[PDB]
Every structure is written in structure tokens, then in C-alpha cells.
Amino acid sequence: CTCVAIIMVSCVTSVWLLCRTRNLCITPYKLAPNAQVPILLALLCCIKPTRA
Amino acid sequence: AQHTESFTSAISATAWSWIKVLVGGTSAFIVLGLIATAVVALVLFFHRH
Amino acid sequence: DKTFPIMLNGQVNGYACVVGGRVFKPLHVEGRIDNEQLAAIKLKKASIYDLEYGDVPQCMKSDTLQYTSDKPPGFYNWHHGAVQYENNRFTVPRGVGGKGDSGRPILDNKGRVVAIVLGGVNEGSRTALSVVTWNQKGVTVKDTPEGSEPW
Known part of the structure; x- marks a missing residue:
């Protein structure tokens, strides 16, 4: 449950970074x-x- | 018989080569046909602008 | 000039222009041609470019000479007015843009056809025309605006 939380908290820093650029x-x-x-x-x- | 006959017991090395030829060439002859329509579609979009 | 209306059930519904080398006819309209010598023209469907087969003989060849690229944005000899832009069609006023007059050519100041109209019934305050153009070296381009009903 920690491992799927690290991926999910890093995936929401993708669409706030890729779409920002x-x-x-x-x-x-x-x-x-x-x-x-x-x-x-x-x-x-x-x-x-x-x-x- | 002392042994058990399997499904691929009778297929030789020559018969395996004709299977790969008669499947791989016909699959690539559609893949080249499918990739041919993906070239002029990109060309037609360049011709529009 | 030389243009032929398309006869369908007694009323006019489209115009079939002729260019030097190949004749034209709109695909979205239908009916019969108004020339006896154009009855032997092989009718065929094509893509969105509105492509027909101009197999007319040499007896009525070289009617309207085509125009090349590098079209200036100046005045053009539209049949019901004028067009004064190159990349887009000029905003023609109201009244023009009715129904059943597709395939009408656009003339130049030198008597050369540069375009063939296809649609654009009405957009509101102004009117945009879905017309064919030549982009840079003579490659045929079909250009359409947003929300252009065929006309």
C-alpha cells in the first residue's frame, strides 16, 4: 500500500508538470x-x- | 510403443521453415500495406498546410 | 466563360465548370448534364477533393486556363461580387450564399480560374466559403472552414 502510494503521489506530479510545460x-x-x-x-x- | 507421440513430433526442420515463410511473409505483406496508408495520410496533412 | 448547370427534375441544383485539361462536377449534387457531347463523360466517385474525369476530346479543349500558386490577396472576379483575400475567402455579404449553386469558379483579373466553390450555406453575420486552392507549387488543396454546410 505504501508502494502504490509513492507511484500515485509521483503520477500527480506528472500531469501538473507535463501539462504545465x-x-x-x-x-x-x-x-x-x-x-x-x-x-x-x-x-x-x-x-x-x-x-x- | 515405448514412447508417447506428441503434436510436434512429425514436423521436421524443412517443414518448420515453410511454416515460418508462409506466415511471416504474408503478415509483413499486410504490415507494409498498413504502413503504406500511414505515409500518404501524413503527406496529405502536409499538403493541406 | 463556359459553365454548365446540372439538370435534376427540372430545377437547377449545381454548376459543372470546365478547366483546361479536365472538367469538373460537384460530387454532393446529382442530376444530368446539359451538354450532348458531355453525356459520354464517365461518371465516377472520388475523395473529398471533388475529382472528376475530364475525358472530353480536343474539339472543345483549352476553355479556361488554370492559375499557378503565389496568388495575390487583391481583387478577384467572383460571379456575384469580389473576393479580396488569399489564405481565407473574403467575407461575402448576405444574399449571396443561397442553395444549389455549387461548383461556381472564381476568376482572376487575367481571365484565369483559381478556385471552385463547394459549400458554406450561412455562418451568421458573415459567410465563409469552403473552396479549393493550390498551396505552394500546384498541389491541389481542399480548404474548409468550421461548420460549413455544403451549398
Whole structure:
């Protein structure tokens, strides 16, 4: 029960850390619809690609 | 008979090679077919923008 | 120009334009063509690109010359007005955007077809058109806005 608590307290520090960096990905680029994202950060380093 | 005959007692080394050829090649010929449709789909998304 | 309405049950429901090398017809509409020499054209279904087979002979070839890429955002010769943007279609006013007039081409200032409309009945205050374009080197692109009913 301790072992499944260590994993669970470390899994909730993932979605508060991965999505925190993911929220800092696209909000500089969601405010610029006339700018093109780089393909290094579009697919590899961050998740959401260009949408039309 | 002193022994017990199993299910794979009669299959030789040549007959095992024809089984792997007639299964592995036909499985990869769909996998290549499945991966072919995953290439032009990525290409068509690049052509849209 | 040269465009052919599609005859279905006595009323007009679509326009079949012709480009130099290959004729066109909207897939989402149906009916009969209005030309005797276009009755031998082999009808086929295709993808969302609205692809038809232009097997017309040389007797009526080279009607409307196509336009290349690098389209300027200036004036364009729309049949009921004008379009003044490149990446998106211009916000055409109300009145235009009724029903049953798909496949109408968009002309250039040099008399060249650059696009074929497909849909966009009504979006509200303005109207966006789901139209086909050529992106960078001549590759055919189908472009659609959000919530575009076919028209």
C-alpha cells in the first residue's frame, strides 16, 4: 500500500508538470495566428501540431 | 510403443521453415500495406498546410 | 466563360465548370448534364477533393486556363461580387450564399480560374466559403472552414 502510494503521489506530479510545460507551449502561439510554429516543437518536444 | 507421440513430433526442420515463410511473409505483406496508408495520410496533412 | 448547370427534375441544383485539361462536377449534387457531347463523360466517385474525369476530346479543349500558386490577396472576379483575400475567402455579404449553386469558379483579373466553390450555406453575420486552392507549387488543396454546410 505504501508502494502504490509513492507511484500515485509521483503520477500527480506528472500531469501538473507535463501539462504545465504544455500550457507554456502553445499560448505564445495561440495568440499569433499569422506565425508558423517550428517542427521541432510542433511534434517532438510538444504535442499539438498545426491545425489548418 | 515405448514412447508417447506428441503434436510436434512429425514436423521436421524443412517443414518448420515453410511454416515460418508462409506466415511471416504474408503478415509483413499486410504490415507494409498498413504502413503504406500511414505515409500518404501524413503527406496529405502536409499538403493541406 | 463556359459553365454548365446540372439538370435534376427540372430545377437547377449545381454548376459543372470546365478547366483546361479536365472538367469538373460537384460530387454532393446529382442530376444530368446539359451538354450532348458531355453525356459520354464517365461518371465516377472520388475523395473529398471533388475529382472528376475530364475525358472530353480536343474539339472543345483549352476553355479556361488554370492559375499557378503565389496568388495575390487583391481583387478577384467572383460571379456575384469580389473576393479580396488569399489564405481565407473574403467575407461575402448576405444574399449571396443561397442553395444549389455549387461548383461556381472564381476568376482572376487575367481571365484565369483559381478556385471552385463547394459549400458554406450561412455562418451568421458573415459567410465563409469552403473552396479549393493550390498551396505552394500546384498541389491541389481542399480548404474548409468550421461548420460549413455544403451549398
